[model samples]
Target: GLPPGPLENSSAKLVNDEAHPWKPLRPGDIRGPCPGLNTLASHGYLPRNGVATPAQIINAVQEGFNFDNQAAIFLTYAAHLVDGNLITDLLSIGRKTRLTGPDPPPPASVGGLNEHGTFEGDASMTRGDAFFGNNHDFNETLFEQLVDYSNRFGGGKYNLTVAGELRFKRIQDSIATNPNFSFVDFRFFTAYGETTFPANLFVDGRRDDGQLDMDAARSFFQFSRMPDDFFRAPSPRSGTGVEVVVQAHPMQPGRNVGKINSYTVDPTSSDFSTPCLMYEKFVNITVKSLYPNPTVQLRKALNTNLDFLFQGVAAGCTQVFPYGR
Candidate 1:
């Protein structure tokens, strides 16, 4: 049995040499000398110089060592003269920048009512003649009236005048509320009669010494309730069709001075003669019809529609955006 093995006749040996293959460090191995460890050891756990605070380390890690973040933080802190609390300074700077630049200019003032409280001097007079007379076109008459009203009252004061029709195409009922014509829904349509007013009207005119000599002005036109005859539908439906109404008001103080001034037609009034025609026309023409239905298929259809609506309304009402640069 000879001492039972190969190890019985052999003894362990240890060899050490720079070029020896016994313990040669291989690529990707963590043994031998680690540059990172050596460097850390030489510099101690914390660097003698430079920022070594726990907060600084945390910030460095969060910022991901990016130049933009560092510059942003530095500029923000410097702006507010913050030394101790960086977070506070950053928040303060953010808040300051978040504020809107300035209030927008008021709407333009078209023309004011006469001392006698009668409509006069409107650009739509020529166009409205058709509607004013016996043989009048529904759409044309509405357009002319709007133009005339805007011209007479909105003259050099307001920005634009928007006029259209309120035609109930159909109606639908909802059973949720009650029954028997539960919710009398009206499907009305509109057409643009007159849309004239530069886009820059508010931008240039709202501020003092700005473009456009007129003061800020705002106006609205709605046609809520209508008579059965107003409905273009060949057949009769639930409620009455709809009526036409106009609303115009000045935004700034001027020729007509009053704490609260509004058009002759009341928004809440039930009278059909002085109905909420403005709103009806706006909804049918501007909102439903004009937006969704367009002759041209332009790029960014939705955005284009929105822009058109915004510009039209702003022009008609003289709404201004002051902070927009």
Candidate 2:
């Protein structure tokens, strides 16, 4: 069963609790493309080992970053169902490892969150394309470009303006270089979500505004550690202003078809502008293709887990059972 939302909102006070003190990763500890999840692990809000159950991840995001219940459940379960071990309900935040236990079946890779095109995608604000041989590691050059954009567009802050320009720039860079670049529905959705994450999740909650400075951004993006004396947000942050970020530049989600430079914008893809359509397409089109056939255990698990994701968009989108009961 999915974990219920936190009984109370996450604390606004300094979250430097001794019990959850920040520490460097020991050898063999996994970290990945997502700086938010990595920071949670480093600070002990999540398991430092990087393997966690769906419930643990749900609680960790809400407790550590003041993620609202909907965002917490939707994002966590979506990643888990796609990349987690369905039988054990264990998910790896970094690269796939035996720590997540045995694989499920053919076509269901269960390759952990770092698995490309599921949750991790191209045009990432910091991470490079899979076509470039290193998709998960922090790319200093890309981070420097982000800093440059922040200075030029945002007056030294990584706000909507900076995110808009940088997001577009990354897409253009990938289109120019990575011949196999893909920005389909799921990739398109997460790329924009991740772009706004620095401002929404990485900022010291005390700041309240969505302006992210380079120092703090460097800590989360590069070191995977929270800044010193950082505080959690005073309130639950359900909306990341992703739509605002999208409207600034507005590029459709698509990819280079087989060759570089000739980009084809996918008319069918969904951005934040169409949450209901995105939710519907994600389950019907994306997840369906991934798990065309499943054992009974996986079938039940996918239905149940996807039900949790649907709750986030239930007001507008219908729930789907890709693997029918």
Best by lDDT: 2
Q: After superposition, how far is residue 263 of candidate 2 from its true place, in Å?
A: 0.6
Off by over 4 Å in 2: none
Model 1: how far residue 252 lies from native, Å: 18
Predict model 1's lDDT versus the native: 0.20
Per-candidate count of clashing residue pairs (backbone under 3 Å):
31, 0
Question: Which runs of model 1 end up more than 4 angstroms from their true locations?
Answer: 1-123, 132-285, 290-302, 311-325
Model 1 worst lDDT window (10 residues): 108-117
Instruction: Note the Cα lDDT for every prediction shown.
Output: 0.20, 0.82
* Candidate 2 residue-wise lDDT at 19: 73
Top TM-score hit: 2
